[PDB]
């Protein structure tokens, strides 16, 4: 396995490579990230909350979560949003990071993306997506403001029940 913001992420299926690339924020920053290119499957293990995540290069497919409560719950998609890499969660950076703190010296770009969206995740949530669910038993959307919905959901983003 691997650890990334505090979840232990297995593979289950599939296959990447990594490699260095530029991206740009919302505010026009660059950004110098590792990234994985490869469709996988994963296990994402936590001490409050558990995922099932499939996704591509950049690109979050299916997110299934499910946790002790909302905030749990919320900072497990938080992570599993920065860890797609995804375009909309670079994009949803809409202010400069700060690089040159002291603190902040030894976070590569995806850790200081990880600490940004812990801070405040709204227009991260604000800025992904919705669409409709055809809503599974057991299962329920979650809304950009991290309320249940049988009708909506962030996109590619189910809650399960524990
Ligand atoms: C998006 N991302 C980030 N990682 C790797 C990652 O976050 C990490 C964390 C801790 C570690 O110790 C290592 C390590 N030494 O290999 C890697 C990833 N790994 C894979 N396979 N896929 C991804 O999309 C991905
Ligand atoms: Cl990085
Ligand atoms: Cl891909
Ligand atoms: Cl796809």
Same mark, same amino acid.
């Given at each position: 396995?691997?650890?990334?913001?505090?979840?232990?992420?297995?593979?289950?299926?599939?296959?990447? %490579?990594?490699?260095?690339?530029?991206? +740009?924020?919302?505010?026009?920053?660059? +950004?110098?990230?590792?990234?994985?290119?490869?469709?996988?499957?994963?296990?994402?293990?936590?001490?409050?909350?558990? &995922?099932?995540?499939?996704?591509?290069?950049?690109?979050?497919?299916?997110? =299934?979560?499910? !946790?002790? *409560?909302? $905030?749990? #719950?919320?900072?497990? #998609?938080?992570? &599993?949003?920065?860890?797609?890499?995804? *375009?909309?969660? =670079?994009? &949803?950076?809409?202010?400069?990071?700060?690089?040159?703190?002291?603190?902040? $010296?030894? /976070?590569?770009?995806?850790?200081?993306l990880?600490?940004?969206?812990?801070?405040?995740?709204? %227009? /991260?949530? $604000?800025?992904? !997506?919705?669409?409709?669910? *055809?809503?599974?038993?057991g299962?329920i !959307? =979650? /809304?950009? *403001?991290?309320?249940?919905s049988?009708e909506?959901? /962030?996109?590619?983003?189910?809650?399960?029940?524990?």
């Amino acid at each position: 396995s691997f650890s990334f913001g505090g979840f232990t992420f297995k593979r289950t299926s599939g296959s990447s %490579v990594k490699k260095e690339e530029e991206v +740009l924020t919302g505010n026009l920053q660059t +950004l110098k990230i590792r990234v994985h290119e490869g469709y996988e499957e994963f296990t994402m293990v936590g001490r409050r909350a558990t &995922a099932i995540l499939r996704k591509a290069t950049r690109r979050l497919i299916q997110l =299934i979560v499910s !946790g002790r *409560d909302e $905030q749990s #719950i919320a900072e497990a #998609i938080i992570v &599993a949003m920065v860890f797609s890499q995804e *375009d909309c969660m =670079i994009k &949803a950076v809409r202010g400069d990071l700060n690089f040159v703190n002291r603190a902040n $010296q030894r /976070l590569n770009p995806m850790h200081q993306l990880l600490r940004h969206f812990q801070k405040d995740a709204k %227009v /991260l949530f $604000q800025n992904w !997506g919705i669409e409709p669910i *055809d809503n599974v038993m057991g299962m329920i !959307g =979650i /809304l950009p *403001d991290m309320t249940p919905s049988t009708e909506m959901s /962030l996109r590619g983003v189910r809650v399960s029940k524990m």
